[PDB]
């Protein structure tokens, strides 16, 4: 009796054949930065500290692969600088002269290519993490303003 | 001085004469099931593991209804198998031979008919959560691509 | 002062007797399909994936009808396959031997005559909804070009 | 080489002296209506639900006007209503008793003379939108078939 | 090798000369307010909760302004009643004898002619924001069905 | 008993032989760029803040093709600037000397020719995504106004 419709739901999730498959609460993401004042950015080469995250990985056999690697896609704010983030921003008058870099666990900084690929890691049978660390770069002098990047991964076995 | 207009805005919502109301938070949303590997889903009547979601109810009073129940309404993959969704796909090459289905709290899958109701549920006098779970489910031979459903629901006091 | 004429506003509307009425939302829309490869299109009973849509009806009352079914009615490509559409082209070399079914939710090719009705679907006091999936369909070798159809439709009580 | 003739295309626009002139996306529209059950136009004075449309005005000054508001002309159904339009009819079997009213966001009919005008609005030095509402009215017994309206307008500053 | 032609992007934005822009997540959203019961809708001056927005500003200079305002421009349900919106319905039977107001935040319903502004808001140089609620509104008896809203906005330095 | 036509349902859709498919949520978008202030458009070579976009692709097979790359097509402003379109104004009075770019995830500027093609890009088996940004460009003093732009694509394996 009193019978009500409701709304609608929705729902997202892939099929793929690989050795280890990508858990369900690292396909989409967001990572807080904070905030960064201009004077810890004043010339070209200028760096701030670096806040961290993870990619994690289930039901992950190692008999039929033993390592795994990533890379990244994105978009570089100069030919010159092949590993920086652009700024995925409002066009509203964000900042100017930053960006945002991805740091290996070996210490490096990663090529926006798609391409270019991480260091090995060794497998076990199950949950695998891997972490990573992300802090901004600049080239040159610093602007008030905003500052949001977004990027893409891709993995190898 | 120096006006300037703005954009556009727009609402949606529903006036119902029911029992207990439908929380604004829970109209529309999106789960999320990360990913599966293919050697998961080998023969038919394979299953992978299961996440959960929640639709809230708020205003709801004890002395005009008692107990409430739901029910489900989308699209078989065959007249068979009357309890699996097809694939909402993009038309583009997604995974075949796969599909989700709705288990209760009880344990059981739903007949997606828009007739086939779920258990009671005991109410209070203000917010009342009910709870289920979504699992992919196989019909034979597992294919990589992709995978998107979607479905619409119903109650009943 | 300085009045000026306007132009013109043209308006589309019907006055029927029935059940339960169409929505406004509904009464013309555009589904897109996207693109799909002639090698998912090889051989006779080729089949890609499938997108949905579906039909909005509001004001509807139960006390006068309970169930509802749809009928639809196009151009066969062929008398011996009589559940496929034709192709709606542009008349300037289009694809040829390909076409667009019509599954309901119960997992059948519907009969394009307009006598064929669908199944049942009880229905509430108020918003009701019906889905429907459409998807690419092949008696043979496919070829390259475009492709564009269109259908109408028809309720009963 | 090999140089064909095309085809033929036309143009269609005016030149107006006035201060706010008319978006090109606004000379010619088509809202439509749906469908509406006879339950719901049972009796004299009977009234359905409203949709809206909307008028756009670029390239606005305010230091040669202010205000600016519209008029309507079209075809009354009776002399003793003078606020509904008639039916652009197919003649061929079209509703009867029926006809579409136009209300002010004041919330009033209009009189259908082409001297009666609207409340004012105050405008930007830009984009300019001037909201309407629609809806169907009746002066008694409904019958069915089918119903299509047309009118034009004229401003004023 | 193998070329073929793609689909078409379209792009809007706007150049505005003023003190402070509108963010590009802002100029068109859609704010849900779920359901809610006739039983809290019974007599004249019946109010229902009220959800919450925001319309975010970016790239805001003191120097040139310092305060700002909004104002709205919609539909009454009435002449008597200047604070209420009507009904963006779909012509097929929505809910009579409801509407929706907009709050301020020192708490005051807002006259819906596109020339009352509300309070003032001290900036900063970058990112603001100015909230603002909504609420249901009932002017008698209520009555099931649909209910949907829309209106646009402008702002003053 | 009591059956009632409906409308008219219409389809767009492609067949092409190539290595991977355009995704149906790709064929015809609408990007948002907000607003921006003339003092940020001050002399020629004035640039604002970017947004970004992507293009789906879908059942992509690595045996057929290794990389991809784009093009693009509309309208120059000027011969001395052939990398900036035209704006797809309303006709009433659009912004004067604006424009906007397309810029590459390596960091340049496209030549809107249809024949400049991009860098390449890795595949995988599966679902594939591209990014791309946009940003306003001015090549002089700017005006208050509208903008709106419009242009198509290609590919190419």
Chains 1, 2, 3, 4, 5, 6 share one sequence.
């Not at 900042?95 to 666990?105: E, K, P, S």
Request: hydrophobic share 40%; aromatic share 6%; net charge negative.
């Amino acid at each position: 009796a009193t019978t009500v419709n409701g709304g609608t739901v929705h729902f997202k999730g892939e099929v793929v054949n690989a050795a280890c498959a990508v858990d369900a609460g690292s396909v989409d993401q967001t990572v807080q930065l904070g905030q960064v004042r201009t004077a810890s950015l004043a010339q070209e080469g200028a760096t701030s500290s670096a806040v961290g995250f993870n990619i994690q990985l289930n039901d992950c056999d190692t008999n039929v692969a033993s390592k795994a690697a990533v890379a990244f896609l994105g978009t570089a704010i100069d030919a010159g600088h092949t590993n920086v983030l652009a700024l995925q921003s409002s066009a509203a008058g964000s900042a100017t002269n930053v960006g945002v870099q991805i740091l290996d666990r070996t210490g490096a900084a990663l090529t926006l290519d798609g391409a270019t690929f991480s260091s090995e890691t060794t497998l076990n049978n199950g949950t695998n993490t891997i972490p990573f660390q992300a802090r901004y770069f600049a080239t040159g002098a610093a602007t008030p303003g905003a500052a949001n990047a977004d990027a893409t991964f891709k993995v190898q076995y």
